[PDB]
Design a protein around this ligand. Structure first.
Ligand SMILES: [Zn+2]
Ligand SMILES: [Zn+2]
Ligand SMILES: [Zn+2]
Ligand SMILES: [Zn+2]
Ligand SMILES: [Zn+2]
Ligand SMILES: [Zn+2]
Lengths: 449, 449
């Protein structure tokens, strides 16, 4: 009984060359919007983040994969939409810093406080602030954290770790870069160590490499972090079959899935964009990555499994799911990698909305941490940066441009970007808001004090 | 009573470095949104166009003028928001052309049909389609067209002209460029001649220059376009006091304001962005244009005058206002020019909202024709294009980058972009829609046959 409707189909309704054929609506939307408005409490929240997934990135992927007049059945399906700002702060002056990194932005939605680029779960004065995940857990809710990146990376770590630098993955880097957080120095520990303490019910991702380090002090001194997790009662899975086999995940038997040494493999392969690549080279067609896997769970699969597991908690659950490599491939000026990760996120959003429609008390949110480099430009463009032409689903060429850095990595950009939601309290993402308003919306939605 | 609320305050609530200080929301928005929803008929429609104003331009402008946690009283105040697609079509194949120009996009919203770049009020078959302005006229409503560009420019031209190329300003160019539209060949004539025939009640903008041209055929043969105009009943005006003098505008005494030979002068000046300008050159503070003028009305002024005059019509009115030079200065890689024109549009939108709040049956819409080049990047960015550092209201530096063309004009981009509305039927802009839906929406709100 989907009391609240999702947008079933907003693809062009007919022939795009004819009058009205490019319409995405079939009639007035007033009543459907009224029906999408509920202030009832949310039992559950599922927060879906496409890292670096700005409006440009969603547009490019739609054009490629679905066609210009196409529709992402997940991404584009959320009825309430708005734009949000994600500015960070300068540590020294406390003034705005126009372009955030993933650590400052994730800290923002996860704690409700602005911070400096590279900070995790701390403010500009380096004070710790409780995260939305720690709060939910303390309230009795089940908690899940899923990402295709290494688990120590910014987006997932922000929910469980409070360190002065996102670089402090394990004991060795923490000692050098976050001496104040170093276990041996009386601190709370490296990101990985804090993650082990946070003890969410379900944690699935990459980053097995760091689990090989040994703790420098404490109860588990001299053992590996992997050993520590086993000693601590975590159930460890490392492949798709092992994950599927899991029937329970909780405080007694928390699940920890480590599917790659670093980040999980990307869905699609293609060449890097190059200088005048749209003039000098032929059009590219993306191709599935063979290293992707049947033993490797996809984001949608990880999403479905977490939901099954966490759904067993009568009080409710909090789940964050990250499509991490949209950003990584945007930095890499690799259209196909970038777009393939966005189609990947869309499958995950579809799974989340099916559950939510069914359940009726679930708030689903789809947004990004910050904007990115990629731009859609005309085919005959002569640009200073890196470009590539692509053969889209329409049978037409689309060119993408990366022109904001002469360095090896293309840059994040500062533009406000799309926020979309479905479910109870969804109205709170409409209009202009701030990334910190999202923490407060989630908190109030679940009724946390 | 203001049955329909606008957003009175979406600025940062307090101290941005403290928990919750950067929030824009004070509490739950459910109720406010509900109250923002109505399906009754609109009596009037005010469409505000920021040419090339994507989310990036809006952000950069807010940051500079109001600060990161600031808020635009006009632009940011519309409660219902979405994202729309504006792709055009390739003329030969009927396939999508990912990056539109200003003529194809204005055609879509003004006629409800997609078209090829450079086309005005015609489909890919070069077949004419009625515009929303012609339709309102036919139903007895008052109609107004205001812009800061030359009135023959694409944006305002699309409501009153049907030509195969937007370059067909007047007889000269038309005979050459759009032979089939040339008066002498049986055509409906050039943009300017067709503008004279469309006969809107209120037409304010630039482009006096083409009016010096003389007709090659027709009843007004051998006379200039201006003479034909006065000759036709037109009340012509060329300055602010003269514009202020006007007490009425109607089919009997239509108003034609020509405040400039070419485009109206921009509000702010600053240096053009340069290669490595953010590293090699000091931060910029924008300078008001001392040659802008007390004799030239501002957009807000033309806007206030147009509403007053058109409101005298009991049946209602349709008004299009264009903040045209946002796009032009974005092409020129001129941050200050670009920002000043957005702040300029904000004032106009503020006037439209005041009226609409008071009037009660007015649908106000704010959006752009397509995306643009400007990007906000980190201060220390080393980019291959044109960059500039600016000193913002926050007292911090923001750097803008233009990196999609090696030619002398930066390019439009294809990204979906913000659409926002207030008033009856505004729900119709929420979520994902296409530019052609805007026509259908407007036509339906007004009940045009
Ligand atoms: Zn990121
Ligand atoms: Zn991330
Ligand atoms: Zn990044
Ligand atoms: Zn334009
Ligand atoms: Zn224009
Ligand atoms: Zn332009």
């Amino acid at each position: 009984t989907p009391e609240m409707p999702v947008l079933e189909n907003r693809a062009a309704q007919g022939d795009i060359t004819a009058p009205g054929g490019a319409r995405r609506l079939t009639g007035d939307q007033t009543a459907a919007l009224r029906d999408s408005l509920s202030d009832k409490p949310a039992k559950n929240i599922i927060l879906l983040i496409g890292d670096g997934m700005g409006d440009s990135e969603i547009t490019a992927a739609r054009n490629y994969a679905e066609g210009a007049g196409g529709f992402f059945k997940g991404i584009d399906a959320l009825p309430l939409t708005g734009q949000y700002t994600h500015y960070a702060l300068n540590k020294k002056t406390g003034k705005p810093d126009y372009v955030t990194d993933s650590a400052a932005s994730a800290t923002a939605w996860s704690t409700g406080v602005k911070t400096y680029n590279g900070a995790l779960g701390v403010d500009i004065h380096e004070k710790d602030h409780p995260t939305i995940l720690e709060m939910a857990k303390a309230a009795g809710l089940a908690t899940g954290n899923v990402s295709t990146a290494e688990l120590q990376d910014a987006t997932p770590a922000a929910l469980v770790a409070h360190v002065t630098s996102r670089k402090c993955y394990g004991p060795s880097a923490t000692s050098e870069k976050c001496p104040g957080n170093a276990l041996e120095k009386g601190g709370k520990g490296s990101i990985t160590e804090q993650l082990l303490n946070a003890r969410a019910d379900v944690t699935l991702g990459g980053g097995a490499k760091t689990f090989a380090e040994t703790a420098t002090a404490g109860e588990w001194q001299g053992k590996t972090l992997r050993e520590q997790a086993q000693a601590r009662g975590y159930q460890l899975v490392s492949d798709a079959a092992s994950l599927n086999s899991v029937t329970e995940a909780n405080q007694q038997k928390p699940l920890l899935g480590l599917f790659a040494d670093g980040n999980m493999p990307v869905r699609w392969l293609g060449p890097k964009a190059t200088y005048h690549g749209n003039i000098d080279k032929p059009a590219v067609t993306c191709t599935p990555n063979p290293q992707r896997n049947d033993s490797v769970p996809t984001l949608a699969q990880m999403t479905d499994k977490a939901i099954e597991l966490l759904s067993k908690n009568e009080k409710g659950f909090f789940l964050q799911v990250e499509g991490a490599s949209i950003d990584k491939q945007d930095h890499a000026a690799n259209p196909c990698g970038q777009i393939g990760e966005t189609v990947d996120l869309d499958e995950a959003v579809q799974r989340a909305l099916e559950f939510a429609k069914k359940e009726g008390n679930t708030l689903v949110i789809v947004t990004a941490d910050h904007a990115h480099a990629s731009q859609i430009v005309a085919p005959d463009t002569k640009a200073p940066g890196l470009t590539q032409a692509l053969n889209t689903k329409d049978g037409a060429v689309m060119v993408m441009s990366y022109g904001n850095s002469e360095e090896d990595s293309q840059e994040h950009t500062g533009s406000q970007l799309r926020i979309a939601a479905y479910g109870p309290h969804a109205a709170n993402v409409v209009g202009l808001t701030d990334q910190t308003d999202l923490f407060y919306t989630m908190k109030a939605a679940l009724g946390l004090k």
